Design a protein around this nucleic acid. Structure first.
Length: 67
DNA sequence: TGGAGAATCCCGGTGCCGAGGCCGCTCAATTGGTCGTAGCAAGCTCTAGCACCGCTTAAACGCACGTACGCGCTGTCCCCCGCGTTTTAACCGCCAAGGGGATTACTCCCTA
């Protein structure tokens, strides 16, 4: 595959970040695009904004290297 | 009585599969101590169970006597058995479905 479409965002960004990795792995060679069908003016928006701010916390809690 | 044949026995061979025995764990039986009680022992009451007597009558019982009903005996038949043919569907195998339930995920708000 080369395209991932989320019909739905999840409350946990790690699960969608895992889901979209399925196409974006050491075997991939085409460009990958991810689309996300956020229906505007709905709680689909708040679900995505909450999931997106969690990803910042999860990036802050890995500010220091694990290398 | 005899006999033929069909039905049941018995003896040996084969297999399979379940019973009897082994092993891990656990959890539920046992050891030891505390505390409440419950039912066991004494003592009192007096309840109603037992025994006896005398009268009444109505229930029991011995016997007369019949006739109503039990049972053996005869006839009939019809309908259920026994056995051969036809047919069906019960049993087995294998796959399918899904349906239920327990675990896991994640928000929201009660309640401590």
């Amino acid at each position: 595959a080369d395209t991932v479409i989320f019909y739905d965002s999840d409350w946990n960004p790690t699960i969608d970040s895992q889901a979209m990795d399925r196409a974006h792995r050491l075997g991939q060679t085409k460009q990958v695009t991810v689309y996300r069908l956020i229906t505007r003016g709905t709680i689909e928006e708040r679900i995505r904004k909450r999931a997106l701010q969690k990803e910042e916390v999860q990036r802050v809690v890995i500010t220091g290297t694990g290398s």
